[PDB]
Ligand binder design. Structure first.
Ligand SMILES: OC[C@H]1O[C@@H](O[C@H]2[C@H](O)[C@@H](O)[C@@H](O)O[C@@H]2CO)[C@H](O)[C@@H](O)[C@@H]1O
Ligand SMILES: OC[C@H]1O[C@@H](O)[C@H](O)[C@@H](O)[C@@H]1O
Ligand code: NA
Length: 358
């Protein structure tokens, strides 16, 4: 549409990821690969607010972006992910979080949003783009038979609504998470998904700051596949552009001129999974298309890197309380540490297998 949030802005590079990358490049023995690994810190990524402990860090990022803009005569943009719902990750085990519905989860989540809003309010010269709660809404479309998800439904919707309503008041551009082609792209799931997204958008007042949806977050699908990956058999929507082209018209019909952003951070290498539902630390993944607003689709505002490559998806250690057997499958890189922590050997392969090369 007419207002692409990235036009005319310089993206503030994540200091969190830059520090991880700088440390990781020092441990890569090949000198040519080390130099290429270090340059990853100059590629824009989303910074995840996966715990209330990281809200003070958001404040420092905003202040630093503000100063950088004034220094260089540019307008700066900070990219964040809101990811702290109570009973988070309801259909899996690896990314269970700090809040629970049973122990004042919604109240705690509302306080988490309020503290984020309080930081953003102090730096109105910095634009913020937020991805809202990966996996949450997609789980309420296909996983209501999962008891943890069914019991979380009303809390999820209330929390997401609280996030959308209050971040809109400080002018944050928001993309709700919308799974990926292998999850909601199945033709039979498109209409239920559209009805849920539309209902969420209506409940939050149809604010123009709710730009649309994010797809493929933390996953590996192609935006435009040369030929279908074999795991996609049975689904005509075998890549993200197929999914988006089928879903976007249903949202427009409901009055929402919705646009999309698509994660390609780990999509450089296709045809590496045994089943489409294998999501954890997939072996042989490579960095994908670099972020750009030259997307080739009327519906896509930007290709982005939301999940930061090198940060683990979950542990292969069967003794951990967060052990998910998806992370022990033959196509999952092992041994792997806890979700969110650095996975050096995985980062090194992402660099080596990057397509296009670094
Ligand atoms: O995409 C990353 C998330 O995947 C979630 O699992 C999905 C999977 O992606 C789909 O392909 C299909 O198998 O449904 C699964 C959900 O039941 C996973 O639960 C999340 O933790 C990942 O972030
Ligand atoms: O790497 C980005 C995010 O990935 C998720 O799987 C983890 O649970 C988070 O802790 C992390 O912030
Ligand atoms: Na995950």
């Amino acid at each position: 549409s007419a207002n692409n949030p990235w036009t005319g802005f310089q993206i503030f590079l994540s200091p969190y990821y830059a520090n991880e990358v700088a440390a990781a490049a020092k441990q890569i023995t090949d000198p040519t690969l080390s130099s290429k690994a270090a340059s990853v810190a100059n590629i824009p990524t989303f910074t995840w607010l996966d715990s209330v402990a990281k809200i003070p860090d958001l404040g420092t990022y905003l202040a630093s972006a503000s100063a950088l803009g004034k220094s260089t005569g540019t307008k700066q943009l900070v990219q964040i992910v809101i990811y702290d719902l109570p009973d988070r990750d309801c259909a899996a085990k690896a990314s269970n979080g700090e809040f629970s519905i049973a122990n004042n989860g919604q109240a705690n989540y509302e306080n988490y949003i309020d503290q984020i809003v309080a930081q953003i309010q102090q730096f109105p010269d910095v634009r913020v783009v937020a991805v809202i709660e990966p996996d949450s809404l997609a789980n309420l479309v296909t996983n209501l038979n999962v008891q943890k998800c069914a019991n979380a439904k009303t809390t999820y919707l209330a929390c997401v609504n609280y996030a959308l309503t209050n971040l809109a008041k400080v002018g944050v551009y928001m993309y709700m998470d919308a799974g990926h082609a292998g999850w909601l792209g199945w033709p039979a799931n498109l209409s239920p998904a559209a009805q849920l997204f539309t209902q969420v958008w209506q409940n939050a007042g149809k604010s123009p700051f709710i730009k649309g949806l994010a797809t493929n977050v933390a996953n590996y699908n192609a935006l435009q596949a040369a030929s279908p990956d074999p795991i996609t058999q049975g689904n005509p929507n075998y890549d993200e552009i197929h999914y988006i082209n089928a879903l976007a018209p249903l949202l427009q019909q409901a009055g929402w001129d919705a646009t999309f952003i698509v994660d390609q951070g780990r999509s450089g290498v296709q045809n590496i999974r045994q089943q489409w539902g294998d999501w954890c630390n997939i072996k042989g993944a490579g960095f994908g298309t670099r972020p750009t607003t030259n997307t080739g689709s009327q519906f896509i505002d930007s290709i982005v890197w939301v999940k930061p490559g090198g940060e683990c998806d979950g542990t292969s250690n069967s003794s951990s309380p967060r052990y998910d057997s998806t992370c022990s499958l033959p196509d999952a890189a092992q041994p792997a540490p806890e979700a969110g922590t650095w996975f050096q050997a995985y980062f090194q392969t992402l660099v080596s297998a990057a397509n296009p090369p670094l």
